[PDB]
């Protein structure tokens, strides 16, 4: 299975990056080719500022022990006003670019990321204009003209149809930027009720994703609209979402959602049985629904007389009993059940 | 994958059973072809008695709504003394058999299960004699002679080498009994320290099982010593074990070990992403180590520029970050990691 450097990408050295929103203390430079400080903002006058500069200086200091680390500033983010005005004229565009190059020289940044969410749309509550889409290309042109070719320029966007037709000229911005930071998450950020309880970052389509929205379709949409594959960065959320309403950090799922009293679920795929670890060590051996499906398979493939448990009294809700009975009597039904529980490669 | 009634077993109608130790209230007759009441015991005089008859009468009453349910009594169990004496002479053997047939007529049982643990061995603290092994066959012969062919007779045993050579004449008892109840569990019941922290019921061998002990090797050992496959019942534990010291009921793992605040882990194998359910409903969408391995695969197979997360601040321990960095830089190492976590069919 595992692909190590595809034999048609001898050139293409794919990079790892994180957006760093807030205190950067727990960033590990050793894992990352690049860090993207979030965020710089635009004030009433169209002037760039950093709300929390100490975080950016702290993050810049990681170049002490890893001088090859790339430090980028992202301007904007959801609800961040100013871009439609900045993009509108040759003057606003020259002024914005000049301030980008000033912030790059001032902080010795490796370059800049633009997070307009989104040109042509007032979904986030910001100003939009029909001309935003063509204007975006001229803004990026104005930034690239000033900062030069030797600095990172990137754009955060989606791969959905609306974005390709109404927000950006993918084929025009492609040769200007170094990367398109595909925000392949938050698929359910605008949904409540039934359509809220779907996947936010499904890699492919299924029953539990929004019709249309999938990572793969966003990568293909961007590729066919003229974005080279090598310039696409695939975005992964380190949070959980359930519709527009609720989000949780991985840290908050790690504490209130997944691992019971620190006991971690493990599987021996040789042995074909589940087990538990806690504090490095092997901690429990039992049978669950999968190892009972596999044992009941063995019964049927090997012409055995049947199966039995020790003992009903240990399984008062008849959860294992059901699995064991279905395993023998209707193994198709139990396989369907476990297709919706056990992660396959 | 899923086998439904192997095309070389048109005859062989494989059965589901449970041992019922203690209060039988939560037995579901609808799941089971047979229930095995545990236990009857042998007193100082060699006389059969039931320590808790009300449980057996309660269990017998399940034949009201399911008259085809088979109700069996198991005599013995771990540490249960008397069998070596009962097996020793033509008199003890006739006397034991007579009392078995009496208990079968008295309770209208469908038959009997013999749980001598184990002939020829004093491991459990019981009496053994070298002659136990040949004597076992004559005891079973004496029971079958009295109860007739129309009653269930079964023997609880293991498939290990010691049991085949020193406890039972598999080829001699085979034609006497209806079933051999393979106790394919407790592999670690006699181990502490390093060799304690292995699997108790591994279906095949691995790094985490005792050298020798596996369900498959016990089924093959019994088959090659002359036990027909159709008479073997495969035993599954509804408890967890860690060496000789600690055991937990499935109910006790369900409460103190596996499902955090009732939140259940589910996987969309189409979508290729994890999610959580609670109270019927879809409850959380996120990315874990598997969906990050799969996303980083997509990056490498599809010649993308790299990957990025939103945001390091949500993953303060760098657990997702590591997975994402290894996913791109050493995908072999991360696959090995997940082979020891994710249950494959």
Residue numbers in the entry:
A (entry chain AAA), B (entry chain AAA): 368 to 712
List sentences from the manuscript:
CotE is a bifunctional spore-coat protein with peroxiredoxin and chitinase domains that are implicated in colonization.
The partially unfolded/refolded protein was crystallized in a different crystal form (P6122). Solution of the structure and refinement against data extending to ∼2.1 Å resolution revealed that the substrate-binding groove was indeed empty. However, the structure proved to be of a 3D domain-swapped dimer. Thus, 244 Cα atoms in the residue range 368–623 can be superposed with an r.m.s.d. of 0.44 Å, while similarly 78 Cα atoms of residues 627–708 can be superposed with an r.m.s.d. of 0.43 Å. In almost all instances 3D domain swapping is a crystallographic artefact and there is no evidence that the 3D domain-swapped dimer of CotE(349–712) is physiologically significant. The 3D domain-swapped CotE(349–712) structure reported here is therefore the second example, with the distinction that it is the C-terminal strand 8 of the barrel that is swapped.
